[PDB]
Design a protein around this ligand. Sequence first.
Ligand code: MG
Ligand code: ZN
Ligand code: ZN
Ligand code: ZN
Lengths: 137, 66, 49, 51, 133, 204, 49, 339, 263, 113, 97
Amino acid sequence: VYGWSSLVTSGVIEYVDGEEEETIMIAMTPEDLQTRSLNDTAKRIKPEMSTSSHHTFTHCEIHPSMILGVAASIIPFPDHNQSPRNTYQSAMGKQAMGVFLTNYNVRMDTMANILYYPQKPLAKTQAMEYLKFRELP
Amino acid sequence: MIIPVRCFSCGKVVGDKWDAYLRLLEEGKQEGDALDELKLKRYCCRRMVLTHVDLIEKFLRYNPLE
Amino acid sequence: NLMGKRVDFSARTVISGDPNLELDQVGVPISIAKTLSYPETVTQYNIHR
Amino acid sequence: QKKAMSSRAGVSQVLNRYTYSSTLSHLRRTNTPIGRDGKLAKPRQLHNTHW
Amino acid sequence: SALFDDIFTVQTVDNGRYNKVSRIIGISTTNSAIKLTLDINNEMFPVSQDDSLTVTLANSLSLKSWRPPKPTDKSLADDYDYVMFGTVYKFEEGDEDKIKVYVSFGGLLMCLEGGYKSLASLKQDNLYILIRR
Amino acid sequence: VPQIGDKFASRHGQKGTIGVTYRHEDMPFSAEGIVPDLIINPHAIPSRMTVAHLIECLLSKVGSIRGYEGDATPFTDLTVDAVSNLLRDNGYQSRGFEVMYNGHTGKKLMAQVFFGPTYYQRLRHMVDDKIHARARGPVQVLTRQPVEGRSRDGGLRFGEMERDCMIAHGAAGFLKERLMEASDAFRVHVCGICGLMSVIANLK
Amino acid sequence: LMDDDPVLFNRQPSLHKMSMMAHRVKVMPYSTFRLNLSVTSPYNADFDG
Amino acid sequence: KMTLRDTFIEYEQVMNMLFWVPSWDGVVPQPAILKPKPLWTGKQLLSIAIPSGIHLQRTDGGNSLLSPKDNGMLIVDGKVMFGVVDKKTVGSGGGGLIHTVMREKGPKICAELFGNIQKVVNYWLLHNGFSIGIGDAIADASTMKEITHAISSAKEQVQEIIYKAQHNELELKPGMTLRESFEGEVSRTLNDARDSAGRSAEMNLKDLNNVKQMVSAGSKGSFINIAQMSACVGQQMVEGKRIAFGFADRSLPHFTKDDFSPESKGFVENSYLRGLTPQEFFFHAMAGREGLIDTAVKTAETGYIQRRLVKALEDIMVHYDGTTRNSLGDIIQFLYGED
Amino acid sequence: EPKVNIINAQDDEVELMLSDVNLSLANSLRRTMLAEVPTLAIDLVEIKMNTSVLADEFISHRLGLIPLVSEDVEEMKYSRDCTCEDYCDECSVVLELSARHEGEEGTTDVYSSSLIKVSGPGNLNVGEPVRRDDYDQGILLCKLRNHQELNIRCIAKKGIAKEHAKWSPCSAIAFEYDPHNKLKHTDFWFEVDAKKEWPDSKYATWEEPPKPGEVFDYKAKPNRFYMTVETTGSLKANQVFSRGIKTLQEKLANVLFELENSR
Amino acid sequence: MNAPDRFELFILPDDVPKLKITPDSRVPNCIIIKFEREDHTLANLLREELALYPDVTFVAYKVEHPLFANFVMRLQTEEGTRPKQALERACASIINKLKTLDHKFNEEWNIKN
Amino acid sequence: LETDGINLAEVMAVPGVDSSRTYSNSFVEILSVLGIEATRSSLYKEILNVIAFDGSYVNYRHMALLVDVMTSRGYLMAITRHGINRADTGALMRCSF
RNA sequence: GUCUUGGGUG
Ligand SMILES: [Mg+2]
Ligand SMILES: [Zn+2]
Ligand SMILES: [Zn+2]
Ligand SMILES: [Zn+2]
């Protein structure tokens, strides 16, 4: 079986804690590894980064959206919101009626709420495939 | 859970189209074309069928209790 | 218990907005209007009501 | 049990099963036991190393 | 039965701020130094530069609750194309012979300069303005 | 079943409660007869700067028209201009505005309305779980004051700041009536000589 | 409780005397209180919970 | 929107609006236009709401009585002669219409004024409509060029200040360190950058822009909201300063050591419409967290202060001889407020 | 003077242009067809055995939302105007649903075609659930597994969409007028040019676009209305239109009756 | 628990009249009509019908609260005309227009066959 | 001149200084040097500065009353238990605070 | 019917 651990042991992904992160130079995206030569008034200006003559990168983020957690991953386009609103959604999505489990009918709990007709969202983030949000909306 | 009988927004009957929609998706037609053939023209009716999640299949796997 | 205390004849619920109410009017739910009460002395001007 | 005072509270909590994402988040939660007795806003601050 | 009859030559017309309203400036053709600034509805009475307007100011249309006019009755407005009703809110008996009158046609404003002998009778409460061409 | 006072939110911090409900014929409609499930107020967008809400409405409209799911992952190379290009290619105003009509009169609205699907949530806070009234009820054993709790048929606390507001208003009689006749009023006998409550009263 | 009864209406925290005001009652269907929208400023209230 | 100069109303909507006014006396006002079609202006219908005997006068930026901009305000016997009716007239500020009606007519008529205005304006807006969309935050290409040019100029200015500080050529300030002078000058430059880009964006907005209408009415939003949505979010501050070097000699591990550029220390060059980068997203999250902490933590000190003030001043009353005394009978003021 | 011009006419929808009528009349017709045309829908459910995973009122809501043939519903009485104490045929149609998985493998789907009309005010043609074709299976109602059973006796009654949306004969009444904005009833938001940025109405080619030399007309009112009624099969489109007209007529006759008999 | 019944919109009680007429004394020859258990459908139809008569000087309606199913209508007429008579005239005229509309729609539907 | 630190008495004496107009932001210093009425004036100036910083306007009489309560005994009475509870009022008031 | 702990709301 070739999975994640084989990548880690083949020397293409490694783990870093906060203290080791002090000593490393992380490229933000795989494209940042090379300087581009654009002018798109619509796409956001990727930062100039002009002060440093030659970058010596040691690491790259797998994807920048992974900094968010479980609750923040439901938000669509969180980079177009002021941050307090992202926090409020992280709080309120935990209070949202859905289907907590598929065996809710053979369980006996103090309280349970089930939505009649759950729908998956029309605008979706890649992360919700791993959170089962499209399976239990 | 199971496909709603009506469209929430306007009230068109969509409960008789889920099986035809699944059969159309089996033979390769993409979702927009299948929704076109079922004659769902308003995007409310279309999102009724396109966003449905069928949970009754998961609920039916737990043994009848009588 | 002395500077502040719990009191009878009070109610609480969520508030809503109503463009059609006057400034000094508050809309009171029927259920609360029936739970709360006012003691009205009977006089020869209010006996029918 | 007889040392309930001077013991950490809330180390175990009732699992939140209101919705699925609330459960997934409760299972990944973390707690700094500073306590609310004290207005030091420094440990409440989002820090660079949190990235 | 009118208070101030005159013919004006339109000098400038600004739209700028608005789509439905334009402000016009016009000096009397017969007696210069009589200035007229007036806001008008474009869609009801469009006006171009250098056009010639017969402008009347009257205290009545005759020869308190508004009701739509019948066909069978007649009034002064029958001979004009654009009639407005307004409120005099300032009568500036100012410098030597500069006399300014201010009328508000429901927020559409008018100013009229000129010597005292032309605008002395324009010291009223409410004024109608009528226009031709 | 949702009613007035139930709490709903979108995924951008835009929470709110239902103020009223309108039927199908009373709601504004587009030329295709589409009516909204939900009408939120424009004055919630500008000072809160929830631009992702509008972008997500636009993406959702395009996805529902073309029969797929929009990708709203953060920090991707997607732009609003491309979404508007798709939407206009589908025969709709590229910025999500539509000409809608007044439900009461059928007359067109002078302004166009930002219209489309958005993912909303049903929050756990329902008004029927909160509405509480008390005329008279159980009291506490020790203080003989109304008990605490909606479930216990309790009373509401008329705390210290409420007393400050009543004092500012100068309503002395109302304050005395709140704190005595709406709460633990009692009658005791004192000794006119020693002023202690050691008097033995047999009223019968 | 009936229409036009004066009732004291209040939102916490009561920072100033205009956080507690007397209103005339109007009895209505559904479970929320109703407020004219110009009084939400002295109460510092809104309709989101 | 209703009292704009180019707002006209036909007879049937006028009749409905008049019937909606609870204190209407049953007299139909003459239309501002009688020919070729009877049209009423919104100012007439709003003047119906105001009681008679009211006079209000305000001057805005020295406008003439002919008011080319329709700014300022003139109200004669309760009738609007000119002036858009906005926050400066019907808000809670002093000297406005609400204060005037309160002082002249009493509390009852002033209370009914709120209802009259609410009903008329709500009916008119019901049949007019008002919305806001994603397009109201979008500036045209030329304004985008101007905004980005201004931001680039400010980045160059900051780089020049940085060069001057590093080659020991910066001019210190009284009561201020060389580093505090450097930081103050950079903060000044970047704040003015954001303000200039916002001014450009605000100037690009048409009168039909919905955000602009809300701001001009004064009912929601301000210039900073427009600036952050359309032009530039700008610089984020944590505890009065820029983004600190939380890592060793850097703010984030995606920067190099000792990089004092605006991007490194928390300047957000994008707008909300354009979207924040991950670094800018994290810095803006830090700033918002600071705000949330302040809101959560200061309220206890404030409530304690107000409780102590109330306990200190609770026993003080104006007596029938005019004096202001406490419960001991001691004089605090011989006449209240000295007047 | 009123005129009708049918543009498309099939069983479920009719597309027509209405002319020489006031806009208030056309909008009243739209509202009446949406809200006040009586139909038949299941208003009372009786559960005998429901051992499915779905709850009793979930299934009851779904059954209430099932369109039923309502051709003769006008010859019927409202169940609040019938002097019977318990229900009767003058004002109700009784249906039965019996479903049961036999065997121990696969899923059995319960469809709306399985509803069976037992009683009802014959020989009125009401009550049957609407089928699109001869081979239609109807609406999906529930699903059943091993030994799971559903035994339900539904009652159907006459009602309108004001009381509950399940009595609405119509889904969406498309409705528009003045495709070229000659009357200037709307005022187009734009970025660069309002003519390029806004799509044309589907009836734009039915009216002449305004000429550049033209001036605004202040006498023109709306006079042509393009509307597309769609139905749920309970009533036919022409039936919906004609009964909306009749319902409006009888509401006006009620007003006239009260006015004359108040003298 | 506080939700009123969905049939109180249209079902007239026995103690509630369908229609109630009071005169407006402020202006001459005017009346105020309250229609119970009706809504914008009848109100707007009647209003735009009456607004086009020469002898009707004022006509208007409002629905004071959306949660209550009634509307009130103010109608004034000239000296000779009575507002009541104009109200029957408007009702009859709309009835005739709907009848003609129905006849033409049925004929058109038959021709389409 | 503006300064870090406070010495009102000695700076007031320095020649070249307007001895009748030197001011301190510490009203305890004002009380020790200039008396209690000057202390009241300084207290009002500080409170007005703190409030009116952001454009807020509190009517004069409220801050006048607050500074008159704080300077009524001849010395500065803080808004604390150490100030409020050293008055001569009844025991029940003091205990209630 | 009581006390602590925990999760929350404005
Ligand atoms: Mg709130
Ligand atoms: Zn639909
Ligand atoms: Zn004794
Ligand atoms: Zn019967």
